[PDB]
Amino acid sequence: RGSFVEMVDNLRGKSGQGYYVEMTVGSPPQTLNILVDTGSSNFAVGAAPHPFLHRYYQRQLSSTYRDLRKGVYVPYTQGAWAGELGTDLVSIPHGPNVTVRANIAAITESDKFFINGSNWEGILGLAYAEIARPDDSLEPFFDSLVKQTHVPNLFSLQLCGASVGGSMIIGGIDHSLYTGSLWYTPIRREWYYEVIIVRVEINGQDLKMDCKEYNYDKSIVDSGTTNLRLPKKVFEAAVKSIKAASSTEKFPDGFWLGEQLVCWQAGTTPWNIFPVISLYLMGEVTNQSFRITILPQQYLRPVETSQDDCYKFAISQSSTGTVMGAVIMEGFYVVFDRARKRIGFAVSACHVHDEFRTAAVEGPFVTLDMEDCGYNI
């Protein structure tokens, strides 16, 4: 038992449907399952019946609910919801031992937002105010937490893939959750958790694209996204290289597009067929980088006959930059060190691997002119 032991194993989820934490809202208490999303900045909860919701927030039963008399609308990559803003008391029973008055969006209508069978009823946007709706004046949850209490301005995520679970440690780091050393990359700007990717390798083979392409028009760390999403030119090069490294086997074109699944008989997946993938990230010292390496166990996602194990290729094309989603995060313990404007990676104690290969975090490397990689708006 480390000091943060009561926050260990506080996340649950279904594979590919996101990881959620229990949050208790209002008075008397209403506890809901809440998607942990480092790619957005609103705290919002289902607040009316929906066919995919087991429960929802009932404002009329909360004596401490305060109406802000303002509507709110959030479009996501393809889901959207509409609702009403207010504030209420919020605690995380398997999180920090504090209660805060936070902004909460009560979701009254939605389109393709709630996911049948996901078990979550709302979303906790952990990114910065810049990207909050309706605007940056709506204080996000984590900002409220830090302003109102002693809790240190840091949280960390261990997402354990392939019924999923994990840990969100709030206000610190738990050393049981990782092995080896933590390596940090700067948060380039406080909006999304924006980072800079400086090199990409597939089975040790450099893709050799200009680093500006890897970060066009941003690279972010996003726990609410399943895939590793890559800019079009990078995606095309990566697929070409992954195909070449997996030459022993042939797969249809649509498999690489995520439009076709390939299944193996139970327990026979030739993980060895597929290459490891490395992203080099900008380090904390001039001209210094480090690399994170994931396995096919991370980027080939099981889709749940019981004797067949089917997989989807979970690297996909993006037109809004690189997104380091669960495919990346499931290899690592990831420290969102807001106080020091940096994100840490270490090998996860829970990551899915085999007897031959493991995810890795290695450094240092020498990479020159990294200040040129970032996109400028």
Q: Which positions are catalytic?
A: 37, 222
Q: CA-to-CA distance for 118 and 33, rounded, in angstroms?
A: 10
CB atoms within 10 A of CB 210: 11
Q: Residue 334: what residue type?
A: V
Residue among 53 and 100 whose Cβ is closer to Cl ion: 100
Q: CA-to-CA distance for 6 and 265, rounded, in angstroms?
A: 39
Rounded to a whole number of angstroms, the minimum distance from the CB of residue 28 to Cl ion is 23
Residue 231 contacts residue 216 (beta carbons within 8 Å) = yes
Residue among 96 and 224 whose Cβ is closer to Cl ion: 96
**Angle 76-79-84 from CA coordinates, rounded to 5°:** 80
Q: Which residue is nearest to Cl ion (CB)?
A: 96
Residue 198 contacts residue 282 (beta carbons within 8 Å) = yes
Residue among 144 and 179 whose Cβ is closer to Cl ion: 144
Rounded to a whole number of angstroms, the minimum distance from the CB of residue 114 to Cl ion is 30
Rounded to a whole number of angstroms, the minimum distance from the CB of residue 7 to Cl ion is 8
- The DSSP line for 155-224 is EEEEEE---EEEEEEESS--GGGEEEEEEEEE--SBTTBB--EEEEEETTEE----HHHHTSS-EEE-TT
Residue among 97 and 205 whose Cβ is closer to Cl ion: 97
CB atoms within 10 A of CB 368: 10
Q: CA-to-CA distance for 169 and 175, rounded, in angstroms?
A: 11
Rounded to a whole number of angstroms, the minimum distance from the CB of residue 96 to Cl ion is 3
Residue 138 contacts residue 85 (beta carbons within 8 Å) = yes
Q: How many CA atoms lie within 13 A of 78 on its CB side?
A: 4
Which positions lie near Cl ion, rule CB under 5 A?
96-97
Rounded to a whole number of angstroms, the minimum distance from the CB of residue 4 to Cl ion is 8
Classify burial at 108, counting beta carbons within 10 Å of its beta carbon; exposed 0-12, middle 13-18, buried 19 or more.
Answer: middle
Rounded to a whole number of angstroms, the minimum distance from the CB of residue 174 to Cl ion is 12
Residue among 174 and 330 whose Cβ is closer to Cl ion: 174
Q: How many CA atoms lie within 13 A of 152 on its CB side?
A: 15
Residue among 97 and 272 whose Cβ is closer to Cl ion: 97
CA dihedral 177, 182, 185, 190 (to 10 degrees): 40
Residue 365 contacts residue 288 (beta carbons within 8 Å) = yes
Residue 322 contacts residue 231 (beta carbons within 8 Å) = yes
